[PDB]
Amino acid sequence: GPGMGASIDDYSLVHKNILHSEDLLKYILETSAYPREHEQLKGLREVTEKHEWSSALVPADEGLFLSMLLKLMNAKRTIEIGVYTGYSLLTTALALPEDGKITAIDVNKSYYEIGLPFIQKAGVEHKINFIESEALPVLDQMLEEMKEEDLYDYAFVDADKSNYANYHERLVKLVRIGGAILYDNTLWYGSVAYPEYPGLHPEEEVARLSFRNLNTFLAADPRVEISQVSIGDGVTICRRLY
């Protein structure tokens, strides 16, 4: 993946999409997304489209959905897990109020520094505390240190696609009651629809199985209410109940 492991040329799902045609997706982006996309988000996206791992980028229509959720729930304190070049991070920082705060975690800060000039020109870098690390030790460290009024309103999870289940067990204690946890890519290009699926590289197949297990688990998890949304590559919204 982009963080470590296999090359991009080993991946086989990246050109698929969950909608029934590219024309419909293109219509959504040109009609409803790009006209509402901040100038620095446009610039960050255009640089990233030339990067080796452009396939991992959160798309522009999903970005506006993330922004809308953040504003409707009046989020102020958030955590971003899996930053890459920072498109979803810049989306979050633009949506939060002036005093919003973001904990952003990624194993590769060189990716983040690609998007940083656009984040700085947007004027919202002051909201971001970037941590270069594997996410799990940071999350475990945070659980030891966090007080009850330090809880997060919102978490966006978009990092190692086979470790979401481990992330979940921490985040249901790091996000406030009534707060939101969002898992990206829970439809995995449609490949979760079958128990067996042909021809995937091991990293892609392991992620596919991980999402099938996670999707079943989240639907049975009494600690949250859920909604799996067929936007982007599938986004599952979790709201903490207790």
Ligand X SMILES: Oc1ccc(CCNCc2ccc(O)c(O)c2)cc1
Ligand Y SMILES: Nc1ncnc2c1ncn2[C@@H]1O[C@H](CSCC[C@H](N)C(=O)O)[C@@H](O)[C@H]1O
Beta bridge partners of 152: 175
Cα 24 vs. chain centroid, distance in angstroms?
A: 23
Tell me whether residue 165 is exposed, middle or buried, using C-beta atoms within 10 angstroms of its C-beta: 0 to 12, 13 to 18, 19 or more: middle
For a copy of itself, the closer of residues 34 and 132 by Cβ is: 34
Least CB distance to ligand X at residue 187 (A)? 10
190 is in an annotated binding site: no
Please say whether the beta carbons of 75 and 48 come within 8 A: no
Tell me which of 4, 5, 7, 14 binds ligand X, using CB under 6 A: 14
Q: How far apart are CA 60 and CA 101, in angstroms?
A: 22
190 binds ligand Y (CB under 6 A): no
106 binds ligand Y (CB under 6 A): yes
User: Which residue type does 8 have?
Assistant: I
185 is in an annotated binding site: yes
158 binds ligand Y (CB under 6 A): yes
178 is in an annotated binding site: no
For a copy of itself, the closer of residues 131 and 207 by Cβ is: 207
**Which one, of 218, 222, 209, lies nearest residue 236 by Cα?**
218
Angle of helix 164-174 versus helix 202-220 axis, rounded to 10: 40
58 binds ligand Y (CB under 6 A): yes
For a copy of itself, the closer of residues 65 and 87 by Cβ is: 65
34 binds ligand X (CB under 6 A): no
Contacts with Mg ion, residue ranges (CB under 5 A): 158, 184-185
Binding residues: 58, 80, 82-83, 88, 106, 135, 158, 160, 184-185
